[PDB]
């Protein structure tokens, strides 16, 4: 018998992004080919199967720095980190291959699916 | 020119609630008349004007325990904490006064608005 506020989840995510933009309560640095990205562990886990596995590990849950595989493109990561906090994906012809590869590595199934569909349409 | 994934914010919130239910990466205990509630500071801040003010304070941001005003009803708090993580509010005739008072204290404007409307309909 609950009532539901339609815009609540979107409003929560918008506020989480405002905290990210002001660097409030960020608790991890993700290092990608020397580029550094500050974020909230909980948001990373909520969006990515890879981060979910990393931060539920009894040793890794306590790390303040996570280094990604050197094949990971920093721009591809940046686009995906923006998607995690906003639901918006900046997918372009010039970045689609790097975005799909990073999303496969991060285990972000819905992003991988739309990249596969957009690539299939271009062939 | 971004594309948007409609269900992303809802999916993020659902995963944050799964982390709460398994007590993963909770970083604060909220004490309400001896009852204790574990949660994520970022989610509390994203939902409440009161928690936003508390955890942006240079001294309070570092506290692992927050004690609420003794007038705050633990059931009212529990219903609001469930709303924060799910967008669902368990509003009933028997709890509406305690829910509205707790939401006014927590500065959760949309909850206060629906409580005022539901109370106005009963008079």
């Amino acid at each position: 018998s609950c009532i539901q506020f339609t815009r609540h989840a979107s409003d929560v995510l918008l506020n989480l992004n405002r905290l990210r933009s002001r660097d409030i309560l960020t608790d991890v640095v993700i290092v990608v080919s020397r580029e550094q990205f500050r974020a909230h562990k909980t948001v990373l886990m909520a969006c990515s199967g890879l981060f979910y596995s990393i931060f539920t590990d009894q040793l890794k849950c306590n790390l303040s720095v996570i280094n990604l595989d050197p094949e990971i493109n920093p721009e591809g990561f940046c686009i995906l980190l923006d998607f995690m906090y906003t639901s918006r994906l900046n997918l372009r012809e010039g970045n689609i291959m790097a975005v799909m590869a990073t999303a496969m590595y991060l285990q972000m199934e819905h992003v991988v699916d739309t990249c596969r569909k957009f690539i299939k349409a271009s062939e | 020119s971004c594309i948007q994934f409609t269900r992303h914010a809802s999916d993020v919130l659902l995963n944050l609630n799964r982390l709460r239910s398994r007590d993963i990466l909770t970083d604060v205990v909220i004490v309400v008349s001896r009852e204790q509630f574990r949660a994520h500071k970022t989610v509390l801040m994203a939902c409440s004007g009161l928690f936003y003010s508390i955890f942006t304070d240079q001294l309070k941001c570092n506290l692992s325990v927050i004690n609420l005003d003794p007038e705050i009803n633990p059931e009212g708090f529990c219903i609001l904490l469930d709303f924060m993580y799910t967008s669902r509010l368990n509003l009933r005739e028997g709890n509406i006064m305690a829910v509205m008072a707790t939401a006014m204290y927590l500065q959760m404007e949309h909850v206060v608005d629906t409580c005022r409307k539901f109370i106005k309909a009963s008079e």
Partner: peptide
């Protein structure tokens, strides 16, 4: 607000 809606009935979910």
């Amino acid at each position: 607000w809606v009935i979910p």
